[PDB]
Enzyme design. Sequence first.
Site, PDB file in Angstrom:
ATOM      1  CG  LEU A  31      38.435  38.458  36.480  1.00  0.00           C
ATOM      2  CD1 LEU A  31      38.401  36.979  36.801  1.00  0.00           C
ATOM      3  CD2 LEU A  31      37.029  38.919  36.147  1.00  0.00           C
ATOM      4  CE1 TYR A  71      39.975  33.786  39.241  1.00  0.00           C
ATOM      5  CE2 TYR A  71      39.323  33.294  41.507  1.00  0.00           C
ATOM      6  CZ  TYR A  71      39.486  34.205  40.475  1.00  0.00           C
ATOM      7  OH  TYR A  71      39.157  35.539  40.675  1.00  0.00           O
ATOM      8  CG  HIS A 126      47.833  42.104  41.231  1.00  0.00           C
ATOM      9  ND1 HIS A 126      48.380  41.334  42.238  1.00  0.00           N
ATOM     10  CD2 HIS A 126      48.875  42.465  40.445  1.00  0.00           C
ATOM     11  CE1 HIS A 126      49.706  41.266  42.038  1.00  0.00           C
ATOM     12  NE2 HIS A 126      50.060  41.934  40.959  1.00  0.00           N
TER      13      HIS A 126
END
Length: 168
Positions: A91, A135, A89
Site C-alpha cells: 500500500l 488496519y 502485498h
Amino acid sequence: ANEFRCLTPEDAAGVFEIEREAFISVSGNCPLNLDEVQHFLTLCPELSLGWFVEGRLVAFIIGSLWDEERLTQESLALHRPRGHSAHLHALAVHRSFRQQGKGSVLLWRYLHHVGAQPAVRRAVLMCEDALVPFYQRFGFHPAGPCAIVVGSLTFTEMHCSLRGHAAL
C-alpha cells in the site's frame, strides 16, 4: 482528473524508473516493491488498484489471491488463481501525499473493488504491530500467529471478511 482503476506492468515500470515514494504511515518499514510485487501486475492485475490525478499515479495497492485459511512464507509472493482471499502485498502513497487520508480512501475502495468479485470472500495481510490499529479501522482483525518474517520482524496476520449482512 481523478480515476481509480487497476494497474498494468507499464504502471509498475513507471514507478521503478524514478526516485522513491512513501510507505503507508510507517517509518522503518519503508516501501519494498523490489520485484516481490512487480510480477503480480502480470499474474493478476485485477488485484491492484491505482489512484490517478490527471493521469498521475498518486497511490496504489498490489495484491494477489491466496487459497488457504492462514498465510505462509510462500504466500507473500504467490498467486493461487482459484483462491478466495485478497492478499494485500503493498500500500503506497506516492509523491508524498502523506497525512491527506489518501491511504484510507484507496484501501476502502480496494476492498470494495476486490469484494465485488464473487470468489473474493475476504482480505488478508501481514503487518507490523504498529500498523495493526490502523488496519482495524477498515474491518481487519488480528487472526493470530502466522510466523512470517520480512527481514527479522515478526508480523501480525490480519483478516477482513468482505461478506457481511448489511443492516446498519
